[PDB]
Design a protein around this ligand. Structure first.
Ligand SMILES: CC(C)C[C@H](CC(=O)NO)C(=O)N[C@H](C(=O)N[C@@H](C)C(=O)NCCN)C(C)(C)C
Ligand SMILES: [Zn+2]
Length: 253
């Protein structure tokens, strides 16, 4: 490992929904929540030996927190990830998750080009229990801005993005649950795909420590494996880190 290039610096964005419901309309409350969540997530990453030996000490740190206090004013037919209304169906509490991640990536493009990753934190009840989404580890994108020309957007967007919602089934999720959502989404950004049932080593039974963080079904941080990366995730992420740390990782602050 290169200690000068072992940290993925993040642009963290709190939308108006997050500011109102998680921040309780306060900047200090909003930032403290995020600083603490990223730091606990960083502990999981930093302590992971990607090759099961000495390839450890890789993590994440916040470079900047953008705090959107109020909804983004939009012109008719114009959409923005921070607008007041949900898209495509305004009658719903939440956006369609895939459309939201695409919109966030479009709006944050200039800022995303300058950071290892951009992450959106929101407060909306995505349909059917979805908690987040991210580019990378899909069956392109993830760590280090990779341009994608959007035919719809008519401009380059960067695929170094992800999002976390702390609202699910009409309530705020536990902090131990939110930590796991962000760890999983950043896991995709770091190159990991979902752990498959077909590989017992990567998807253990409840009496064998339970599921790892990359399992497609949400885990409550009460089982032994829930806050850890599987050997499947480690193999995928090890390859990403090897290829990507020299490109955009920085020295730990
Ligand atoms: C932190 C979790 C692992 C992220 C995944 C989505 C995902 O893979 N994002 O990258 C999820 O939201 N999963 C939901 C999940 O497991 N949500 C739980 C909290 C839930 O609501 N379960 C109820 C089952 N009807 C699904 C979409 C599978 C329902
Ligand atoms: Zn996933």
């Amino acid at each position: 490992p290169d200690p000068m290039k072992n940290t993925c610096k993040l642009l963290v964005v709190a939308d108006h929904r997050f500011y109102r419901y998680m921040g309780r309309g306060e900047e200090s409350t909003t930032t403290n929540y995020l600083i603490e969540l990223i730091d606990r997530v960083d502990d999981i990453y930093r302590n992971t030996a990607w090759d099961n030996a000495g390839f450890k000490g890789y993590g994440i740190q916040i470079e900047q927190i953008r705090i959107l206090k109020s909804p983004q004013e939009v012109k008719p037919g114009e959409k923005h990830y921070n607008m007041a209304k949900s898209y495509p169906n305004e009658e719903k509490d939440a956006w369609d998750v895939k459309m939201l991640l695409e919109q966030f990536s479009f709006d944050i493009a200039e800022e995303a080009s300058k950071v290892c990753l951009a992450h959106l934190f929101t407060y909306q009840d995505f349909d059917m229990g979805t908690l987040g989404l991210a580019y990378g580890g899909s069956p392109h994108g993830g760590v280090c801005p990779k341009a994608y020309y959007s035919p719809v957007g008519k401009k380059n967007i960067y695929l170094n993005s992800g999002l976390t919602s702390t609202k699910n089934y009409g309530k705020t999720i536990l902090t131990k649950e939110a930590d796991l959502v962000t760890t999983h989404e950043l896991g995709h950004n770091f190159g990991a795909e979902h752990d498959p049932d077909g590989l017992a080593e990567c998807a253990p039974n409840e009496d064998q420590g339970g599921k790892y963080v990359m399992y497609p079904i949400a885990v409550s941080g009460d089982h032994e494996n829930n806050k850890m990366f599987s050997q499947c995730s480690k193999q995928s992420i090890y390859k990403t880190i090897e290829s990507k740390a020299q490109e955009c990782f920085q020295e730990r602050s």
